[PDB]
Design a protein around this ligand. Structure first.
Ligand code: HEM
Ligand code: HEM
Ligand code: HEM
Ligand code: HEM
Ligand SMILES: *[C@@H]1O[C@H](CO)[C@@H](O[C@@H]2O[C@H](CO)[C@@H](O)[C@H](O)[C@H]2NC(C)=O)[C@H](O)[C@H]1NC(C)=O
Ligand SMILES: *[C@@H]1O[C@H](CO)[C@@H](O[C@@H]2O[C@H](CO)[C@@H](O)[C@H](O)[C@H]2NC(C)=O)[C@H](O)[C@H]1NC(C)=O
Ligand SMILES: *[C@@H]1O[C@H](CO[C@@H]2O[C@@H](C)[C@@H](O)[C@@H](O)[C@@H]2O)[C@@H](O)[C@H](O)[C@H]1NC(C)=O
Ligand SMILES: *[C@@H]1O[C@H](CO[C@@H]2O[C@@H](C)[C@@H](O)[C@@H](O)[C@@H]2O)[C@@H](O)[C@H](O)[C@H]1NC(C)=O
Ligand SMILES: *[C@@H]1O[C@H](CO)[C@@H](O)[C@H](O)[C@H]1NC(C)=O
Ligand SMILES: *[C@@H]1O[C@H](CO)[C@@H](O)[C@H](O)[C@H]1NC(C)=O
Ligand SMILES: *[C@@H]1O[C@H](CO)[C@@H](O)[C@H](O)[C@H]1NC(C)=O
Ligand SMILES: *[C@@H]1O[C@H](CO)[C@@H](O)[C@H](O)[C@H]1NC(C)=O
Lengths: 309, 146, 141, 309, 146, 141
């Protein structure tokens, strides 16, 4: 602001219009233009003295596009976070906004006894986003239904600066999961050598028929006839709040440590990236036909509600 | 890679008794059959559909020779591995985007075809020396990756 | 995930091993301990020196578990049942090691049966060993 | 230079709106808002660093509403100027803008001979506006048609500051002169005692039939039959470029020294004050029925043209 | 106002033989008839339309007494005129807005009705002394005007 | 501006003056020089003391000009023709003085004809003298 020239018999009124950094969006009531009072107040007709806020754009990677392949070369999954237990097991996160990330309740408890309180689990975790950027976590919230929804929320102490590398995915406004839809699953979990992957990778997986999946893992469909038919040692959590994905065209699958990652769909109408699911059952490896994802639609209400406090 | 005096003789000695062109063509074909997501890199090679097709593929045979002959050059200089494969590392990382898992997988496949062709000659101690070598060229190819 | 054709190849291949199983078991162990010395960590109470009949013995147990698995291919978790908690919980052996041992099993198999180990069979045996590896690692916490 | 508050993750774009001192008005093509360039210069979308200008609001007195009466109590005729000849005769002026005033050519020559050059008349004059404020005059221009249009322009050395007291009248955009319309004539000329008025006064006069007027002063209408029938000693200049006014309801008239004052009409649509005429013949006193005014419409072209240099 | 020893006797003497109430009523009425713009100040007095109406007007008669009796008070103190009429000057200027021309005109009208009523008694020299007086009260009324 | 009724009044009132005209003329002059001593300025060559027959004479000329005017009311500038350039140009007498003399004429008229000087006639004579004043001042430059 160089002072503007004076004009004879006339004076000057000062204003400003606010703009946001790239990757952010102006949030106001409010036209963004603020103007200096005789009271030395910067004011706007709509919002009073209240300034605009800058908010991270979500689900819009700067460069859009696990036992099998697809190395993430371009950094196309900005929302992916890597979480590590005190006892050194890697698992997935997926950043949902500037200070929150979704994850599985199971991932959260990797260190500890299943009755461990969230207060005691949080100091234990290490969380990373983008390149090796660590983020400092404040709090952790398990989902209210222990047995059914495998989900937890991670609140960071403060907002992550958003850039090419780090940026949240979008929560869906609709139900994307119908069979045959191919989502993108990025993950930090174990690979074909049963080693935690050193570089972040992604697979493309089709969503699978829900009845076929339940017949696969359980008897089933009548509850009293259900048996534990899982071809790996352990049983998925399977209900109305979950969906299944098959293997890739190339027979690639998801494995230990991949849970907590998003089943990420790219909406062609929006050109935006939505999290349709969070990987719950990462034990398929190539051994079982189906991974199991908790569907983000089911947890949407709870997410907004929880973030509200 | 750190390799003993007797380990080098073992490796060099055995290498004199194997057909590297033939093992490359077998090793690449097996990797393609056994770990099918690797076929993704080879779309241009023609028919990869079934196993006989992959093994029978003239371009697979020919490309496999190229990789195993690149291995031979590896054995030539063990002390400087990183620099030998530095050029190829740039290609494999920045051009082709191969996950280093795949270098390790192919390395082990080569080891199982050496076992298959050499039989009793490829005994636990000579295999242990070869593991040091295949881990060396895998790590030398993954070197240019960040 | 072990198709009918896979299962046929596995049954066929392991049957062809026959009496050599316990011996293939011990050889795979020695190859693993030499090739990937870190695996030695889980066996501090073993004499691991060459010709050790404490490993000759352990190799037999491993071969047997595998023979049991080959007879049970439609249910692996059931066949391997006791061994899952053993490796995952008591012994707590990191899942990377299972691909190592599987590899060595494959090396032994290829060395001893070169005309029976064609890429289809190689593929089937790899998947089988992989499925065993998963069953034995899925409870790792 | 003023310092607006800071947004996190956002930057300001500086603007200014120009405003004008009261009694003045913004003159520029585009709005008065200039935003700061990345080239560090203040720019308008339409005027491009060309600044706005402040010019005087004309024809809008702060306090709206000669032988007879009506003392100007409120100072309702800000455009009225008093002009005095070297030989001490008072006459009228009427300020037309910040640096110009209309007057009659006759007024201008009061001291002088028929042929005196304008260069020589100007230093001779004294001119006052508002309260006794003197304004210093630069130049004087007689109208090109000596015999027909009794008019001159007076250019001040510099612009008058405009206020309650001093402010220009408006030039008409239309023809206000139709018979029966009552204009306001303010004037410094002689009163019922034949003395120059000590305080400024105004009369309200109706415009009169032009034909009746010509029959009154001249034969007439056929030129060769015209005779000098003026009831005072002297003849008005009467043509297409003039109009006539009658006496007031109260029989008040205009007298020596009132020439040069405006016949001022108040447009009810505009709520603004326009000069419909300039008093030419001030000899009417109460003796003759009609004063004669040159119509401002006729001199409009010439006025803008002349001010252009 | 500067007025001579004999001039004062003249004025005071003459004033004794005139009906001031009657001359005020006549003088105001004549001012109204002769200089019609003065009727503007009197709108509230009722009918001013023709001359007989103005002279016949009861409010004109009554108001005229008031101004001419104000004049009587003027003669009482000549040396301080400005202060006598100071109150009225405020009224006439700041309230009523009367141009001082009108004070002068009414002053002279009063002089012509004095002439009309007093005839040969109101000779050039006594008129000259009255002019000094009417100019004195006109100037005293115009005093509060800026 | 001297209506028909005005003209009637003026003609009537001046006719009533009659042979006194020249005397009224001189009386108005003496009243003016005494009442408004500044008017004396224009007559430096005159004996202005009381009883001066140089003013008695001048008053006759003034009364005559007036009688001529009353006979000519439909054309004042023509009746007064020579006198306009005289007062306005040669003598250059400031217009304020004319209301002074007119006033004195009115005073004289009222004093000498109290029952003929009613407010209507007063009004007509004032206007007449005003019109004469204008004709004699309109060329003042
Ligand atoms: C020890 C491991 C490997 C070695 C020594 C090796 C060596 C080579 C060499 C020498 C070339 C020649 C390219 C040139 O001359 O410009 C090549 C090309 C190539 N390699 Fe590798 N390679 C290895 C692993 C892999 C793996 C695991 C894959 C895929 C799963 C792969 C995919 C490719 C592809 C797609 C090309 C391009 C050839 C074409 O145009 O078709 N490589 N490699
Ligand atoms: C195909 C994969 C494997 C199979 C089928 C297998 C099978 C077995 C069997 C049958 C036993 C004996 C249990 C008993 O005697 O009750 C055993 C024990 C054991 N295994 Fe494995 N195993 C496998 C992989 C591994 C690997 C990769 C490691 C470590 C690198 C490992 C470490 C051990 C250890 C330390 C014991 C205890 C041995 C003792 O104390 O005698 N196992 N396993
Ligand atoms: C020598 C000259 C004058 C004198 C001595 C004089 C004196 C007075 C006095 C004593 C009053 C009484 C008001 C009161 O008691 O508050 C008055 C009122 C007034 N005068 Fe004058 N006056 C003079 C001239 C004039 C003239 C020339 C005009 C108008 C042309 C005028 C217009 C008025 C008006 C409108 C009022 C208000 C009375 C009412 O309520 O109707 N005066 N004057
Ligand atoms: C009703 C108004 C007047 C009338 C009708 C009138 C008429 C006349 C006439 C008839 C003459 C004589 C011209 C001659 O002898 O050729 C005259 C001369 C003159 N007048 Fe006036 N006059 C008027 C007003 C005045 C006034 C107000 C003044 C000055 C206060 C004035 C100053 C003179 C002088 C100085 C002369 C020359 C006298 C001499 O030198 O003998 N007149 N006027
Ligand atoms: C992984 O977890 C272990 C314990 O669960 C960490 O403990 C380390 O143990 C090594 C020796 O094996 C020490 O040299 C380190 O100083 C220890 N570090 C800590 C924080 O205890 C271990 O650090 C973790 N990761 C690694 C690479 O050692
Ligand atoms: C008006 O004009 C005259 C000349 O046209 C001015 O001349 C003055 O004359 C008086 C005496 O009569 C002197 O006392 C002054 O000093 C003169 N002043 C000038 C500037 O010449 C006259 O000033 C003007 N007005 C007044 C009020 O005197
Ligand atoms: C397994 O990977 C090891 C390295 O650590 C892994 O990859 C690195 C970059 C990190 O992401 C780390 O957290 C992972 O655990 C190797 O030292 C080791 O040789 C590898 N084992 C085999 C068989 O490849
Ligand atoms: C005549 O006017 C005198 C005042 O001066 C005049 O008017 C003022 C404002 C100036 O313009 C000035 O140059 C003029 O000469 C009064 O003092 C005087 O009383 C007036 N005489 C009569 C009869 O009204
Ligand atoms: C947690 O799981 C264990 C068994 O693994 C069980 O014995 C225990 O009761 C459980 N505690 C809670 C709070 O679920
Ligand atoms: C899980 O279900 C049980 C049922 O009583 C409940 O008490 C418990 O609070 C739930 N979860 C945890 C972590 O305690
Ligand atoms: C110029 O003045 C002379 C006298 O000096 C006069 O005769 C003539 O008519 C005048 N012309 C104009 C246009 O005033
Ligand atoms: C008047 O106009 C004529 C041209 O028509 C010109 O010759 C003359 O100089 C002008 N006179 C005056 C006084 O402007």
């Amino acid at each position: 602001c160089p002072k503007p020239p004076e004009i004879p018999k006339g004076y000057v009124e000062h204003m400003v219009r606010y703009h946001c950094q790239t990757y952010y969006k102006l949030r106001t009531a409010g036209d963004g233009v603020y103007t200096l009072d005789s009271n030395k107040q910067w004011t706007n007709k709509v919002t009073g003295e209240k300034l605009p806020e800058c908010e991270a754009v979500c689900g819009k990677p700067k460069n859009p596009v696990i036992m099998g392949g697809s190395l993430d070369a371009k950094g196309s999954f900005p929302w992916q976070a890597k979480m590590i237990s005190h006892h050194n097991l890697t698992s997935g996160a997926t950043l949902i906004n500037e200070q929150w990330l979704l994850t599985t309740a199971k991932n959260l408890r990797l260190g500890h006894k299943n009755d461990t309180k969230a207060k005691d689990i949080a100091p234990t975790l290490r969380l990373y986003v983008g390149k090796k950027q660590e983020v400092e976590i404040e709090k952790v919230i398990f989902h209210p239904d222990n047995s059914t929804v495998d989900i937890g929320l991670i609140k960071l102490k403060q907002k992550v600066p958003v850039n090419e590398r780090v940026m949240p995915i979008c929560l869906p406004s609709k139900d994307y999961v119908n069979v045959g839809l191919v989502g993108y699953v990025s993950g930090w979990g174990r690979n074909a050598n049963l080693n935690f992957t050193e570089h972040l990778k992604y697979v493309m997986l089709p969503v699978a028929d829900q009845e076929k999946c339940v017949q696969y893992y359980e008897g089933s469909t009548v509850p009293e006839k259900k048996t534990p038919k899982s071809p790996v040692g352990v049983q998925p959590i399977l209900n109305e709040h979950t969906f299944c994905a098959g293997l890739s065209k190339y027979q690639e699958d998801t494995c230990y440590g991949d849970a907590g990652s998003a089943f990420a769909v790219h909406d062609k109408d929006d050109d935006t990236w939505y999290a349709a699911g969070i990987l719950s059952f990462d034990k398929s490896c190539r051994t079982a036909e189906y991974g199991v994802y908790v569907r983000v639609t089911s947890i949407l209400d709870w997410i907004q509600t929880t973030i509200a406090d | 890679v750190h390799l003993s005096a007797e380990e080098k003789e073992a490796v060099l000695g055995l290498w004199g008794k194997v057909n590297v062109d033939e093992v490359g063509g077998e090793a690449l074909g097996r990797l393609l059959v056994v770990y099918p997501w690797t076929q993704r890199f080879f779309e241009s090679f023609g028919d990869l559909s079934n196993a006989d097709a992959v093994m029978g593929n003239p371009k697979v045979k020919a490309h496999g020779k190229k990789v195993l002959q690149s291995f031979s050059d590896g054995l030539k200089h063990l002390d400087n591995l990183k620099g030998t494969f530095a050029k190829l590392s740039e290609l494999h990382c920045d051009q082709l985007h191969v996950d280093p898992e795949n270098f390790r997988l192919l390395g082990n496949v080569i080891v199982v075809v050496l076992a298959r062709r050499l039989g009793h000659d490829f005994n636990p101690n000579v295999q242990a020396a070869f593991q040091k070598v295949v881990a060396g060229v895998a790590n030398a190819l993954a070197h240019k990756y960040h | 995930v072990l198709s009918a054709a896979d299962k046929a190849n596995v049954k066929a291949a392991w049957g062809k091993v026959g009496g050599q199983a316990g011996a293939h078991g011990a050889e795979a162990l020695e190859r693993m301990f030499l090739g990937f010395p870190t695996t030695k960590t889980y066996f501090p109470h073993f004499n691991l020196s060459h010709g050790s009949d404490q490993v000759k013995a352990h190799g037999q147990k491993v071969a047997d578990a595998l023979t049991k698995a080959v007879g049970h291919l439609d249910d692996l978790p059931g066949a391997l049942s006791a061994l899952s908690d053993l490796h995952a919980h008591k012994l707590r052996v990191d899942p990377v090691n299972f691909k190592l041992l599987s590899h060595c099993l494959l090396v032994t198999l290829a060395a001893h049966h070169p005309d029976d180990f064609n890429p289809s069979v190689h593929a089937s045996l790899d998947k089988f060993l992989a499925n065993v590896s998963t069953v034995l690692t899925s409870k790792y916490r």
